[PDB]
Symmetry: D2
Subunit: 307 residues, 4 copies
C-alpha cells in the first residue's frame, strides 16, 4: 500500500512531567491526547499509562482501565500497548497490560541495551517530583533488558492472544535479532519494524543511519516487513519525512519528542501529527485510516481485545 500509517506515541516513559505541561499524565489526558491524535490522522496509538498524581510510569493494568475503553468508543484507531514501559521496571510485570488486555498490537523492544537519559539533566534542572531526577540519573547504570529468552516468551504469550507487534529496533543488531526469530518461525509476516533513531544507547540520527537501517531490513525481510520511522526529539519530523518520501510509515508523539519547532514545546500530540501530515500531503501521499492500517499490518480487529 501507498498509504502512510501515522503511529502516535502519546506519552511514554522517558519524558517526565516537569519537562512540559503538555505531556499527558492523567487518564483523561491520555484519552484526549489519543482521540485528538486519531482525529488528526493517527491510525495507531502507542500507549503507556502514568500515575495520575505525579506522572511516574506505571504498567499496572488498573492504570489503563479507564482510558482504553474510552479511546475504543471514541475512535477506531488501533490501540498499541507497551510491553516495555520504563527500563527501570522488571519483566513478566511489564507484560500484564498486554497479556491482560490482549490488544491488536503491542510494542516489542528487539534487544537489551543501555538507555542514556541522564544527559536530559543538562537541559532540565528543576523538577516538581523527586522521582523525576532519579528516573534520569539512574538511567546511567541501568540496562533495558530484552534477552533472547524474554523476546521468545513475549512472542509466544502475546502472539498466543492474536496480538501482533511493533518491533522496536534501535540498531542494526535488533533487525538481525528479529531475523533470528523470523527464521525460527516465531513471528509471522508482515513484520511492523519501527526503526528508532537518536537515543543515547541506540543508533544515532544521521541520514546514513536511516539508510543503513532500511538497506538492512530490505535485505533481511524483503517484502515481508512494513517500515516505520521514529526519530527522537528534534529529529522526529526530518527523519519521518525522509522515510515518508521513500515509502515508509511514520511515528510521532510527545513520548518521542516534546517539540513542535526549535525551542517550542508541542501543545498536543495532534500538533505533531499535523506537522508530519503537511509533509505527507506535500509528497502527494495519503494518510492511512485505522481500517487501512489493520489490513496492512494483519491485525485481529477491535472486537477482539479484552476491553
Amino acid at each position: 500500500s501507498r498509504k502512510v500509517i501515522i503511529t502516535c506515541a502519546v506519552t511514554g516513559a522517558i519524558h517526565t512531567p516537569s519537562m512540559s505541561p503538555y505531556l499527558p499524565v492523567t487518564p483523561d489526558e491520555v484519552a484526549q491526547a489519543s482521540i485528538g491524535a486519531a482525529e488528526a490522522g493517527a491510525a495507531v496509538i502507542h500507549l503507556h499509562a502514568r500515575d495520575p498524581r505525579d506522572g511516574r510510569p506505571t504498567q499496572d493494568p488498573a492504570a489503563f482501565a479507564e482510558f482504553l475503553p474510552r479511546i475504543k468508543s471514541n475512535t477506531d484507531a488501533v490501540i498499541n500497548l507497551t510491553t516495555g514501559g520504563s527500563p527501570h521496571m522488571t519483566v513478566e510485570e511489564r507484560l500484564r497490560p498486554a497479556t491482560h488486555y490482549m490488544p491488536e498490537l503491542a510494542s516489542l523492544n528487539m534487544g537489551s541495551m543501555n538507555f542514556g537519559l541522564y544527559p536530559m539533566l543538562e537541559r532540565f534542572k528543576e523538577f516538581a517530583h523527586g522521582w523525576e531526577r532519579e528516573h534520569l540519573e539512574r538511567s546511567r547504570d541501568l540496562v533495558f533488558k530484552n534477552t533472547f529468552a524474554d523476546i521468545e516468551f513475549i512472542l509466544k504469550t502475546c502472539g498466543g492472544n492474536g496480538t501482533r507487534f511493533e518491533f522496536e529496533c534501535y540498531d542494526t543488531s535488533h533487525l538481525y535479532n528479529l531475523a533470528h526469530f523470523v527464521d525460527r518461525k516465531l513471528a509471522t509476516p508482515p513484520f511492523f519494524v519501527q526503526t528508532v533513531f537518536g537515543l543515547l544507547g541506540g543508533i544515532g540520527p544521521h541520514p546514513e543511519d536511516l539508510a543503513h537501517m532500511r538497506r538492512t531490513a530490505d535485505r533481511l525481510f524483503g517484502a515481508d516487513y512494513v517500515w516505520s520511522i521514529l526519530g527522537a526529539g528534534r529529529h522526529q519530523i526530518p527523519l519521518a519525512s525522509i522515510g515518508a518520501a521513500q515509502g515508509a510509515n511514520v511515528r510521532v508523539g510527545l513520548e518521542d519528542s516534546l517539540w513542535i519547532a526549535p525551542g517550542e514545546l508541542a501543545e498536543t500530540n495532534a500538533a505533531q501529527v499535523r506537522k508530519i501530515r503537511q509533509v505527507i500531503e506535500g509528497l502527494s501521499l495519503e494518510v492511512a485510516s485505522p481500517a487501512e492500517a489493520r489490513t496492512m499490518l494483519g491485525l485481529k480487529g477491535p472486537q477482539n481485545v479484552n476491553f
Copy 2:
C-alpha cells in the same frame, strides 16, 4: 544558514510544448512563469529561452532580450542562465547568453554524457511541430559534450565576469570532475552543487543514489559546497524532500517535471514551488530570500548584470 534556497527551472530544453500546454514558450510566458515562481518563494530562477513560434530551444541571446529585463524589474530573484541549452547545440555558441548578459549565476554541466530523451516518445505519440519528435529521437545518437577543455573554458570565461555556477552533477563522476577543477584552483567556494537524479544517461532516482551523492560531495568538498537536489519527473518532490529534511536546498520547475501530482499536469511553476514549500513548512524550515541566497552563494548582485 538553516534557510532553504528554492531554485525554479521554468522551461528548459528537454520537454516539448506538445507534452503540456503549461510549458512556458514565449517571452511573456517565461517572464510570467519566473515572476510567479519567485513570488511563490523561488530565490533562484533557472532560465532557458525558446523560439516563440514553435517552442524549440534557442541559445541566441536575442531570445532572452525581452524576458530578462522584465523579470529583473518585477523581482529581486537571482537570474541563472543556462550554458547548455539543448545537447543538440555546439559550445562557445552555447556560452553566448552567459558571456553577453554576465549573469549572477550560470549553469555548468559537469561532464560529457548521453541524454536519453527518446523514451518519452512512448508516452507522447502526437506532436504539433515536426521538430519535437526529432528532438527526442535524435537524443539517441547524440552526446551532450562538456569536455575537460570545455569546462575549463566556461569556468574562465564566465567566472571572469563574476558569474558563479550552478554545477549540474548527474552522477558521481561529475562530483569528481568538479574536485579536479577545485584542486587546480579553477573554481572557488562556495560551490553550488545541483545533484540531478532520474535522467536516462545520468544517475537514477533511488534514495541510495541521493545518499551516495551527498557522501561523495561531503568527502570531496566538506563545508565548501551548498547542496541542491533536482529529481526529474515524479521524483521531483520526494527527492527534494529527502534533501530538504537533511539541510539541502531544492530545485523544482517545469523544466524538470511537468507534473504536480500523479497523472496531474502542473499548471504553473509556482504550484511546484508551493508544493515543496508545504514540505519545507512541515519541517519547520524557512525559505531563503534572494538576498539570503546571494549571501549563501557569494553572488555579485542584481544590479551587476548586463541587462
Copy 3:
C-alpha cells in the same frame, strides 16, 4: 560458483610505451604477455593491438592477425577484444576487430564520458615518440563517445555473432544504461559487469564508490549479473581484493596499472595476476578455469571464433 574469474588486460590504449619498458607493444610481446597471464591463472585476456614501431594504439584488424591465432593455439583462455580501442578513434572503425574476428568476448563501454589522461603528464615527462604527449594532452578535449545508438549497434552487431560483452561501467549511470538495454531485451544474461574505478572522468576509487556500484548492480540485475572489479593504477589490487572478499571477480593487467607495488613497475602482466591470486588464496577461494569462466558467462567456445 564460488570460483573467481581473473581477467587480465595486457596493454590497453591508455598507457604509452615511454612510461614503462614492460608495457607490451609488438605482437610477440602481446602474445607472450597473454600466455604468461593465462598460465598465471587469468581465464580471460582483454586485448588491444599497438603499432610495433611506435606503440601507438591501432584498431586495424591486420594489427591483431598474428597474435590472436598464436594466443589461441597456446592457451584455452578466453580472448576478449576491445571495441573501445583509443577514445581518439572513431566508432565502427573501433568495431572492426570484434566484427571481423567474432570473438567470445568483446568489451563495451556503457556510456559517453570524458577521459582525462592529461594529468599523467605530471608524472611522465620524457617520451620517445611525439604521438605519446599528443595522446595524453588531447584527451583534455576528447569525448569518449558511446551514445545510446552506438551501444545498440554494438549489442546487435557483435551479439549477432555470439560475442558476449564485458560491460565496462565507469559510474552508476552506466549500470542504469545497461538496465535500459536489458529492459528493451537487447542484452541477455548473464551480464559480465566490469565496474571501473579511479579514472578521471569516471567514478573514483573510494571503498564507498565500490559499495555503491555493487548495491546498484544488485538492485538492477539481481542474480543475472557476474561482477568484476577494475581499479585503475594503485587501486588495482586493493579494490579487486575488497571485491574478491565478497563474491566478485577481478581484473588486473598493465593496461589498467603499470605498478606491482608503490613506485615499483610491474615487469609482467603475470606478476599482477599472481598478486591478486595471493589474496584469493588467502580468502580460501579458487581461481576459475577458462572452461569454468565460459560456463559462468555463457560463452560460445574457443573454436567458435574467426581466427
Copy 4:
C-alpha cells in the same frame, strides 16, 4: 603509517574446549599460542584466562600469573587483557586482571547487549564438561552488561593506570556510545576501535555492515581513531581483508574463529596470522611490529606494566 597491526585473540571465553582440541586452555598453551602468534606477526595479543582443569572462563588474576610473564619474556608483542571475560561473570570481578596487572591495553565492550551463543548447540552436541552446555544455553537469558556507569568506571580506573583500550564496538550504537565519552573527554586519542561483526546480538557480517561502521567512525572520530576489524567465525578473513585493503588493521585468533578454511579447524592461532598475512602481502602492505603498534596506539611501553 601504512603498516597493518595484527591483533591475535588467542582463546577468549566464547568457544568451549570440546569444540576444538586446538583451543588453548592451560597457562602453557596460552603462552605458546601467544608467542607463536607474535612470531607469525601479531603485534597485539588479546588475552583471557581459562580454568586449566575444565577450560571454563575465569577472570581471577591468579589464572594469568604464569602466562603473562612467560609471554612478556619471550616477545615484545603488546599484552591486551580482557575486561569482559565471560558475559556470565559480574563487574568487579571483570576488572581485577586489568586493574591488577595494569596492561598497556585492555578490551572494553561499548554497550550492554545480548550474546546469543546457544545456536552453537546446533553444531556441538557432545561436551566433556558440564559447564560447556550450560555456558551456551544460558546465553539465551543473559545480558552482557556494560552500562554507561560501568564504562565510565573502567575508563577512569584503568585509564588512571596508563592502560589504553581496545574499544570493542559490536554495532553503530557502540560507536555513538564511544563518541559520548570522547565528548566528555573521558578517553583521549587515538582511539583503538575494534569493530566486531557476526555475533548474534551484535551487527551482522555483511559488507554493508562493515562500510557503515567505517563511515560512522570516520564521521564521529575523523583522524583520531585507529580501526581494526574482527569478523566472527568464517567471516574472519574476508572482513579483515576488506578492512586491510582500505587502510584498516586486523584481528584474528581462535577466540573469534575456530577455523582456518571451510570445515578445517585451525591448528594454531599463528596459522590464522599467516592466512591474513597472505592478503596483507598481496596488497603490498607491511605488518606493524610491536614498537610500531605502540606508536600508532599511544601505548605506555612493555616495561610499564605490573607483571
